Amino acid sequence: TDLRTWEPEDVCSFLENRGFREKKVLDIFRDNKIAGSFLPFLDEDRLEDLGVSSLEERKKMIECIQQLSQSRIDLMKVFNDPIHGHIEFHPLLIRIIDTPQFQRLRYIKQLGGGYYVFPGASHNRFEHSLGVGYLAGCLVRALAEKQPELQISERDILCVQIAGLCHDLGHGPFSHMFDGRFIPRARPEKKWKHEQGSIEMFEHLVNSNELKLVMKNYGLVPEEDITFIKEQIMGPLWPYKGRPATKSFLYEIVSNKRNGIDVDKWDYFARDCHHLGIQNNFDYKRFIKFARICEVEYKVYIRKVKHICSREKEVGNLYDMFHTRNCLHRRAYQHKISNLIDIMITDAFLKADPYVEITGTAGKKFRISTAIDDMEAFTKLTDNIFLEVLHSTDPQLSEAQSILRNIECRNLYKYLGETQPKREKIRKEEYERLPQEVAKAKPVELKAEDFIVDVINVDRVHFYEQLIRVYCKKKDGKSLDAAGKHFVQWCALRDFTKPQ
Ligand SMILES: [Mg+2]
């Protein structure tokens, strides 16, 4: 048989009939629920830590495990990804992957409204998450071998990979729309980032599935390493608790908000380029080969820190990345229609929010906007909520439905145009006024609700503007003219660029 089939009792029987007949040692295995699959991943140190203090017994235990047919690499899992080709994962990663909490990412489109503009962009967060995990693994491995002095362990690598996998665990329906348009609009009081949901959901993930114990059985130390994983996704002498300042560079792998060069961006750049029909000048494998840790000293008392660094002449590669970054941002991300669709879906959700029930832990009812507060409710919240509203028989959603039917039948708000501020920019406070200003600026009455104003912000590494779009809801010609000239006058009045 396989060790995969073996229960802990089976392992106990195997241990007994091989000579380990002592009940406490058997109790170790029963207690820690060490199913067969773990056996080829056990260490001298692990057997020590689990609690066999016999310096010679441990060796022979591992010998017995080695005698068996199935080994370590016999239990890895291989994905076929079109971006990365073949992909090996250590079984723990699969165990994390194979949960409701994670699998839910199959049902959230990466580009959200994008899919309704770019029919190629059907890809979801799931596969992207896989990709990020894999790349994280790759970069950390490369740095590990190239500089063995760095003391980078299996544990670290796995933590980095898990951080990779779970960086997007907490995205809501339609990805950035949810955390970027809907929640801020529906819960202005709460400051919420999909990362927040990511760490909360990871915490939910390990707990719903009792993987703390499994993580221990595979050689992680849950207390430290979960904090490490969480901190990698989230962020903040040395602030982090997960790892010592000596291994600071590890925090630059998965999320590097400092200079915007991380494996997340690598994967989604490549993938979005793949599905949108854009060809990507940036070879990340080149980056990984020429990636090294080395020390930097900046005087603030002088600080000394280990950053990820690239050979100075590999600057051209970054020029390629940032081109692709701009290329995607211009063409796809800040796309005037995609955003319109995001806006309309948000609107529908806002109008659907009061009536739609979603049950969480203990079956407590939650609204779409409040599901983020309960992971077991949020676990059920996916893109499909789009159809659930659309198909609902409840007549209180008829308003919400009609918006969704309009998205389906391409009856969208009319895009009046884009504008740019000549000087200064617009205060985050000043936003909610804007639809009123446009409405009241005169060149038929046009109420403030008839307009949406969409503000968009355009936006280092070490070696060894504002766009305003105005949409009008009223779709008739005369209202369209009126709104157009309203918008022109508003632009002229605030001394903005003459519209597109
Ligand atoms: Mg991501």
Residue numbers in the entry: 72 to 307, 316 to 379, 385 to 527, 533 to 548, 559 to 563, 589 to 624
What did the authors write?
The sterile alpha-motif (SAM) and histidine-aspartate (HD) domain-containing protein 1 (SAMHD1) is a dNTP phosphohydrolase that restricts viral replication by limiting the cellular dNTP pool. The active tetramer form of SAMHD1 is induced by cellular nucleotides, which bind two allosteric sites of each subunit. To better understand the regulatory role of the SAM domain, we crystallized full-length mSAMHD1 in three different states (0, 1, and 2 allosteric nucleotides bound).
The 1-Allo crystal was crystallized with dGTP-α-S in the crystallization mixture and diffracted to 3.4 Å resolution. The No-Allo and 1-Allo mSAMHD1 structures also crystallized as tetramers in different space groups (C2 and P21212) with 4 or 2 copies of mSAMHD1 in the asymmetric unit, respectively. Although mSAMHD1 is capable of forming tetramers without nucleotides bound to Allo-site 2, these states are inactive and likely represent activation intermediates of the enzyme. In the absence of nucleotides, mSAMHD1 exists in an equilibrium between stable dimers and inactive tetramers.
